[PDB]
Design an enzyme around this catalytic site. Sequence first.
Site, PDB file in Angstrom:
ATOM      1  N   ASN A 194      44.817 136.333  66.822  1.00 61.92           N
ATOM      2  CA  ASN A 194      44.091 135.469  67.265  1.00 61.92           C
ATOM      3  C   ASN A 194      42.972 135.822  67.644  1.00 61.92           C
ATOM      4  N   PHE A 195      41.834 135.886  68.257  1.00 65.22           N
ATOM      5  CA  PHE A 195      40.440 136.874  68.704  1.00 65.22           C
ATOM      6  C   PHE A 195      40.215 138.132  68.115  1.00 65.22           C
ATOM      7  N   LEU A 196      40.229 137.306  66.531  1.00 65.39           N
ATOM      8  CA  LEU A 196      39.551 138.975  65.879  1.00 65.39           C
ATOM      9  C   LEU A 196      38.076 138.636  66.062  1.00 65.39           C
ATOM     10  N   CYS A 197      37.703 139.469  66.754  1.00 70.23           N
ATOM     11  CA  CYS A 197      35.596 139.431  67.001  1.00 70.23           C
ATOM     12  C   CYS A 197      34.802 140.730  66.866  1.00 70.23           C
ATOM     13  N   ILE A 198      34.469 140.530  66.410  1.00 73.95           N
ATOM     14  CA  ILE A 198      33.102 142.549  65.985  1.00 73.95           C
ATOM     15  C   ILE A 198      32.024 142.190  66.282  1.00 73.95           C
ATOM     16  N   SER A 248      29.200 142.750  58.849  1.00 74.57           N
ATOM     17  CA  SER A 248      29.256 143.524  57.353  1.00 74.57           C
ATOM     18  C   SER A 248      29.360 144.329  57.174  1.00 74.57           C
ATOM     19  N   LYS A 249      29.908 145.634  57.861  1.00 76.39           N
ATOM     20  CA  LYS A 249      30.583 146.767  57.509  1.00 76.39           C
ATOM     21  C   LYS A 249      32.030 146.825  57.228  1.00 76.39           C
ATOM     22  N   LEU A 262      34.986 146.302  58.665  1.00 70.26           N
ATOM     23  CA  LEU A 262      35.386 146.638  59.885  1.00 70.26           C
ATOM     24  C   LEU A 262      37.252 145.502  59.491  1.00 70.26           C
ATOM     25  N   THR A 272      45.070 131.269  62.300  1.00 67.24           N
ATOM     26  CA  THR A 272      44.028 129.667  61.186  1.00 67.24           C
ATOM     27  C   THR A 272      42.652 130.111  61.379  1.00 67.24           C
ATOM     28  N   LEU A 310      45.106 127.736  69.733  1.00 62.51           N
ATOM     29  CA  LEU A 310      44.274 128.397  70.702  1.00 62.51           C
ATOM     30  C   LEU A 310      43.152 128.056  70.139  1.00 62.51           C
TER      31      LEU A 310
HETATM   32  C1  LIG Z   1      52.996 141.306  59.928  1.00 56.36           C
HETATM   33  C2  LIG Z   1      51.057 141.307  60.562  1.00 56.36           C
HETATM   34  C3  LIG Z   1      50.276 141.268  60.211  1.00 56.36           C
HETATM   35  C4  LIG Z   1      49.657 140.714  60.853  1.00 56.36           C
HETATM   36  C5  LIG Z   1      47.942 140.686  60.030  1.00 56.36           C
HETATM   37  C6  LIG Z   1      48.065 139.225  59.676  1.00 56.36           C
HETATM   38  C7  LIG Z   1      46.400 138.506  59.050  1.00 56.36           C
HETATM   39  C8  LIG Z   1      45.319 138.619  59.912  1.00 56.36           C
HETATM   40  C9  LIG Z   1      44.034 137.217  59.492  1.00 56.36           C
HETATM   41  C10 LIG Z   1      42.695 137.567  60.738  1.00 56.36           C
HETATM   42  C11 LIG Z   1      43.234 136.240  61.509  1.00 56.36           C
HETATM   43  C12 LIG Z   1      42.865 136.261  62.795  1.00 56.36           C
HETATM   44  C13 LIG Z   1      42.270 134.683  63.056  1.00 56.36           C
HETATM   45  C14 LIG Z   1      40.668 134.196  64.240  1.00 56.36           C
HETATM   46  O1  LIG Z   1      40.613 135.128  64.687  1.00 56.36           O
HETATM   47  S1  LIG Z   1      39.883 133.049  63.319  1.00 56.36           S
HETATM   48  C15 LIG Z   1      38.257 134.257  64.285  1.00 56.36           C
HETATM   49  C16 LIG Z   1      37.801 134.723  64.065  1.00 56.36           C
HETATM   50  N1  LIG Z   1      36.706 135.117  64.773  1.00 56.36           N
HETATM   51  C17 LIG Z   1      35.254 134.795  64.481  1.00 56.36           C
HETATM   52  O2  LIG Z   1      34.927 133.953  63.701  1.00 56.36           O
HETATM   53  C18 LIG Z   1      33.752 135.190  65.685  1.00 56.36           C
HETATM   54  C19 LIG Z   1      32.748 135.458  65.082  1.00 56.36           C
HETATM   55  N2  LIG Z   1      32.823 136.206  63.736  1.00 56.36           N
HETATM   56  C20 LIG Z   1      32.969 137.605  64.140  1.00 56.36           C
HETATM   57  O3  LIG Z   1      33.072 138.058  65.208  1.00 56.36           O
HETATM   58  C21 LIG Z   1      33.192 138.128  62.640  1.00 56.36           C
HETATM   59  O4  LIG Z   1      31.997 137.524  61.634  1.00 56.36           O
HETATM   60  C22 LIG Z   1      34.405 138.879  61.872  1.00 56.36           C
HETATM   61  C23 LIG Z   1      35.248 139.554  62.863  1.00 56.36           C
HETATM   62  C24 LIG Z   1      35.411 137.388  61.717  1.00 56.36           C
HETATM   63  C25 LIG Z   1      34.694 139.075  60.268  1.00 56.36           C
HETATM   64  O5  LIG Z   1      33.681 140.504  60.376  1.00 56.36           O
HETATM   65  P1  LIG Z   1      32.576 140.493  59.557  1.00 56.36           P
HETATM   66  O6  LIG Z   1      31.461 139.024  58.966  1.00 56.36           O
HETATM   67  O7  LIG Z   1      31.489 141.282  59.411  1.00 56.36           O
HETATM   68  O8  LIG Z   1      33.079 140.807  57.950  1.00 56.36           O
HETATM   69  P2  LIG Z   1      33.634 142.141  57.242  1.00 56.36           P
HETATM   70  O9  LIG Z   1      32.596 142.793  56.313  1.00 56.36           O
HETATM   71  O10 LIG Z   1      33.911 142.705  58.753  1.00 56.36           O
HETATM   72  O11 LIG Z   1      34.681 141.869  56.791  1.00 56.36           O
HETATM   73  C26 LIG Z   1      34.531 140.911  55.463  1.00 56.36           C
HETATM   74  C27 LIG Z   1      36.056 140.705  55.010  1.00 56.36           C
HETATM   75  O12 LIG Z   1      36.757 140.167  56.483  1.00 56.36           O
HETATM   76  C28 LIG Z   1      37.170 138.550  55.749  1.00 56.36           C
HETATM   77  N3  LIG Z   1      37.172 137.459  57.154  1.00 56.36           N
HETATM   78  C29 LIG Z   1      35.894 137.087  57.385  1.00 56.36           C
HETATM   79  N4  LIG Z   1      36.046 136.409  58.419  1.00 56.36           N
HETATM   80  C30 LIG Z   1      37.661 136.475  58.373  1.00 56.36           C
HETATM   81  C31 LIG Z   1      38.312 135.811  59.240  1.00 56.36           C
HETATM   82  N5  LIG Z   1      37.934 134.990  60.344  1.00 56.36           N
HETATM   83  N6  LIG Z   1      39.821 135.902  59.125  1.00 56.36           N
HETATM   84  C32 LIG Z   1      40.335 136.441  58.328  1.00 56.36           C
HETATM   85  N7  LIG Z   1      39.395 137.219  57.761  1.00 56.36           N
HETATM   86  C33 LIG Z   1      38.038 136.990  57.913  1.00 56.36           C
HETATM   87  C34 LIG Z   1      36.156 138.413  54.810  1.00 56.36           C
HETATM   88  O13 LIG Z   1      36.723 136.702  54.092  1.00 56.36           O
HETATM   89  C35 LIG Z   1      36.211 139.547  53.373  1.00 56.36           C
HETATM   90  O14 LIG Z   1      37.125 139.538  53.070  1.00 56.36           O
HETATM   91  P3  LIG Z   1      37.990 140.160  51.749  1.00 56.36           P
HETATM   92  O15 LIG Z   1      36.438 140.477  51.156  1.00 56.36           O
HETATM   93  O16 LIG Z   1      38.465 141.610  51.611  1.00 56.36           O
HETATM   94  O17 LIG Z   1      38.155 138.679  51.137  1.00 56.36           O
HETATM   95  C1  LIG Z   2      30.899 122.773  70.743  1.00 50.72           C
HETATM   96  C2  LIG Z   2      31.526 124.205  69.789  1.00 50.72           C
HETATM   97  N1  LIG Z   2      31.448 125.683  70.557  1.00 50.72           N
HETATM   98  N2  LIG Z   2      31.803 126.106  69.280  1.00 50.72           N
HETATM   99  C3  LIG Z   2      32.341 126.739  70.008  1.00 50.72           C
HETATM  100  C4  LIG Z   2      31.959 124.687  68.142  1.00 50.72           C
HETATM  101  C5  LIG Z   2      31.856 125.938  67.105  1.00 50.72           C
HETATM  102  C6  LIG Z   2      31.791 124.092  68.398  1.00 50.72           C
HETATM  103  N3  LIG Z   2      31.804 122.246  68.054  1.00 50.72           N
HETATM  104  S1  LIG Z   2      32.698 122.103  67.685  1.00 50.72           S
HETATM  105  O1  LIG Z   2      32.615 120.587  66.438  1.00 50.72           O
HETATM  106  O2  LIG Z   2      33.724 121.543  68.866  1.00 50.72           O
HETATM  107  C7  LIG Z   2      34.139 122.738  66.549  1.00 50.72           C
HETATM  108  C8  LIG Z   2      33.273 123.025  65.292  1.00 50.72           C
HETATM  109 CL1  LIG Z   2      31.954 122.697  64.534  1.00 50.72          CL
HETATM  110  C9  LIG Z   2      34.529 123.930  64.183  1.00 50.72           C
HETATM  111  C10 LIG Z   2      35.358 124.856  64.593  1.00 50.72           C
HETATM  112  C11 LIG Z   2      36.721 126.438  63.714  1.00 50.72           C
HETATM  113  C12 LIG Z   2      37.037 126.770  64.815  1.00 50.72           C
HETATM  114  C13 LIG Z   2      38.065 127.473  64.582  1.00 50.72           C
HETATM  115  N4  LIG Z   2      38.214 128.344  65.799  1.00 50.72           N
HETATM  116  C14 LIG Z   2      39.320 127.911  66.823  1.00 50.72           C
HETATM  117  C15 LIG Z   2      40.485 128.111  66.459  1.00 50.72           C
HETATM  118  N5  LIG Z   2      40.950 129.608  66.863  1.00 50.72           N
HETATM  119  C16 LIG Z   2      41.855 130.168  66.446  1.00 50.72           C
HETATM  120  C17 LIG Z   2      40.331 129.882  64.917  1.00 50.72           C
HETATM  121  C18 LIG Z   2      38.357 129.692  65.398  1.00 50.72           C
HETATM  122  C19 LIG Z   2      36.150 124.731  65.577  1.00 50.72           C
HETATM  123  C20 LIG Z   2      35.343 123.702  66.829  1.00 50.72           C
HETATM  124 CL2  LIG Z   2      35.719 122.622  68.328  1.00 50.72          CL
END
Ligand SMILES: CCCCCCCCCCCCCC(=O)SCCNC(=O)CCNC(=O)[C@H](O)C(C)(C)COP(=O)(O)OP(=O)(O)OC[C@H]1O[C@@H](n2cnc3c(N)ncnc32)[C@H](O)[C@@H]1OP(=O)(O)O
Ligand SMILES: Cc1nn(C)c(C)c1NS(=O)(=O)c1c(Cl)cc(CCCN2CCN(C)CC2)cc1Cl
Length: 391
Positions: free
Chosen positions: A113-117, A123-124, A126, A149, A391
């Site tokens: 959880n808490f993957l964040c860039i 889009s690099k 990372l 999730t 969460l």
């Molecule tokens: C054995 C232990 C294993 C442990 C590891 C298990 C796996 C864990 C997996 C992580 C689970 C985390 C659970 C959570 O925390 S979910 C919440 C994720 N956080 C956010 O949405 C915060 C706002 N967004 C950002 O910070 C960035 O847009 C993120 C960091 C999300 C992507 O940064 P950016 O937009 O700059 O992209 P890129 O250029 O670096 O990379 C593009 C690649 O990344 C793939 N992508 C995009 N979004 C996600 C995502 N949410 N899960 C997995 N992969 C993702 C995408 O399809 C493409 O893949 P591909 O081209 O290779 O097919």
């Molecule tokens: C009020 C609100 N704040 N945020 C940040 C967002 C997306 C909303 N709108 S919402 O309808 O409550 C909503 C919407 Cl649209 C979409 C989502 C999917 C978010 C998934 N995150 C929540 C759990 N985490 C482990 C992965 C990232 C969650 C929620 Cl809670």
Amino acid sequence: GGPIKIIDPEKVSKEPDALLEGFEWATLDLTNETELQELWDLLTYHYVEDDNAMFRFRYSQSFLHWALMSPGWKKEWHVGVRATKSRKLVASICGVPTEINVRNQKLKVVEINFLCIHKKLRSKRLTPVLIKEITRRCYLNGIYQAIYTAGVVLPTPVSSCRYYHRPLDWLKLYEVGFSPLPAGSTKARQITKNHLPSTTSTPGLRPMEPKDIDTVHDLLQRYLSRFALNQAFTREEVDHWLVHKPEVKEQVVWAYVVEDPETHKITDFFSFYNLESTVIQNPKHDNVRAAYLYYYATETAFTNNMKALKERLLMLMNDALILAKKAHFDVFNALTLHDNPLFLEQLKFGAGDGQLHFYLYNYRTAPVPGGVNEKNLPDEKRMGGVGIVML
Ligand SMILES: CCCCCCCCCCCCCC(=O)SCCNC(=O)CCNC(=O)[C@H](O)C(C)(C)COP(=O)(O)OP(=O)(O)OC[C@H]1O[C@@H](n2cnc3c(N)ncnc32)[C@H](O)[C@@H]1OP(=O)(O)O
Ligand SMILES: Cc1nn(C)c(C)c1NS(=O)(=O)c1c(Cl)cc(CCCN2CCN(C)CC2)cc1Cl
């Protein structure tokens, strides 16, 4: 199902991979106040938004402490990336350990959880690099599977669940652009429609206490065992996740039990947590205070009388809404997982745009039902699937 690949311990690198130039790996120590603050600064400005950039999750520092230092936690699984010069934290990716049941095989996993860039580093590619690094750290500790999730579709989801939202302060939600006005309706009708009773109805409802831990643990495990994919709680996990310790800074978890007025056994419980969203660039409101339905259980479930279960859940969850409303939440959120389709529409939860997709790393199993049909509407014949909440 089962594992996809076996990892060779001999071959796991003892060094991390290269990063983008000018950046380096950093283990976070979230027991350091100043490091917890750096994580909070990063998530507060760069973490999950809705598609329209009106809202951004604002996990509090108490919440980060609770979610990330759960039983068995290791600082090694709290991975930061810092700018080499400035030392600024610009990305994070986190894990905590737990056990899950996947169609009755127990597995030791990390929950990611808490993957964040940082916006400026997006889009690099990372992300793959962050993933691969936390993966290495898990493999070094003998963990080879994960569950996570996301609100986005990625390869091979194990399930998908829809968000539902029960307004508590409908007008606030209207004003921030969260809640629509239905086509032929008026604001008065919507306010009237969302009224709730002033007091709870379930006999013997009270807050959860430490003395309730073993009973709740037993009840939750029995109930969660009804789901193909579920979290296999320990006692410590029940302590950590369900019992609020007023000595955090800011309450994160609310848990209530039903002590049977006659037997005094606990027969039900439910819990919900506090996650606020920043309201972006609205001069009149800066915050949406959401409660999210977390874990719950009820002995009524073991009868397999689906009608009696429904009845019980309509009562318990309306009480959850009353309580959240007394605790000044603006909305109550729930997903279509657990037995939630039994009550969502009846308690006036509206369908959300958001979806939560569930994924397993290095484990194959048949898709699991997520509480919705082909139209993404709630479906009582597509439950029994997802019994884990993240969460
Ligand atoms: C054995 C232990 C294993 C442990 C590891 C298990 C796996 C864990 C997996 C992580 C689970 C985390 C659970 C959570 O925390 S979910 C919440 C994720 N956080 C956010 O949405 C915060 C706002 N967004 C950002 O910070 C960035 O847009 C993120 C960091 C999300 C992507 O940064 P950016 O937009 O700059 O992209 P890129 O250029 O670096 O990379 C593009 C690649 O990344 C793939 N992508 C995009 N979004 C996600 C995502 N949410 N899960 C997995 N992969 C993702 C995408 O399809 C493409 O893949 P591909 O081209 O290779 O097919
Ligand atoms: C009020 C609100 N704040 N945020 C940040 C967002 C997306 C909303 N709108 S919402 O309808 O409550 C909503 C919407 Cl649209 C979409 C989502 C999917 C978010 C998934 N995150 C929540 C759990 N985490 C482990 C992965 C990232 C969650 C929620 Cl809670």
